[PDB]
Amino acid sequence: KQYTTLEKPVAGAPQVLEFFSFFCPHCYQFEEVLHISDNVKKKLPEGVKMTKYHVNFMGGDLGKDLTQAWAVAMALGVEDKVTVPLFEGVQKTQTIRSASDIRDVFINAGIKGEEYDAAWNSFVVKSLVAQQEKAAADVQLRGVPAMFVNGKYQLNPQGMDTSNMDVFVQQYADTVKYLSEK
């Protein structure tokens, strides 16, 4: 009803693991309009580790570039500065068409060009690309957005109420908190 339980339960996963794509329209709403992750964080214990991974299977050649740039954002700790301009650059203005345009967002957000390029080519970033791929494969990820709790329960927003946005977010955050105590 509110979630499903995987028939193939994954060990070693983070407490709460989200998957998204900057090409994914529902992900744009989840992040920019509903602020799902933020409210899940607020209604969670002050220690829970939240992980957010980008996926490859939307956007063509640009899809893999965004996963690498997300790995860059993770390695630099600049997720809170690039998430919004990347969503708007991909879905709103649609001015992001190349790897260079993804880089322009990072530079405008304050990451020095040299720092972006070094991270972009770093093997630390290469490993982050591998974790994101491996984590989605561990759950045989079927589309985005998606949220997994303790590698066993997957959120199911089809049953929550989409008439009121605050009710929806509250129901969603309440189900995540519920599932993290199982």
Swiss-Prot record:
Disulfide bond in keyword set: yes
Major subcellular site: periplasm
One of the record's GO cellular component terms: outer membrane-bounded periplasmic space
This protein's record includes keyword Signal: yes
A Gene Ontology BP annotation from the UniProt entry: cellular response to antibiotic
Domain of life: Bacteria
Cross-referenced Pfam families: DSBA
Domain Thioredoxin: 1-125
Entries under SUPFAM superfamilies matching the protein: Thioredoxin-like (SSF52833)
GO MF term set: protein disulfide isomerase activity; protein-disulfide reductase activity
Phenotype reported upon loss of the gene: Induction of the PhoP/PhoQ two-component regulatory system, suppressed by 50 uM CuSO(4).
Annotated compartments: Periplasm
This protein's UniProt keywords: Disulfide bond, Periplasm, Redox-active center, Signal
Gene3D superfamilies: Glutaredoxin
Cystine pairings recorded for this chain: 24-27
Family as reported in the entry's similarity comment: Belongs to the thioredoxin family. DsbA subfamily.
Function (record text): Required for disulfide bond formation in some periplasmic proteins such as PhoA or OmpA. Acts by transferring its disulfide bond to other proteins and is reduced in the process. DsbA is reoxidized by DsbB. Required for pilus biogenesis. PhoP-regulated transcription is redox-sensitive, being activated when the periplasm becomes more reducing (deletion of dsbA/dsbB, treatment with dithiothreitol). MgrB acts between DsbA/DsbB and PhoP/PhoQ in this pathway.
Protein's name according to its UniProt entry: Thiol:disulfide interchange protein DsbA
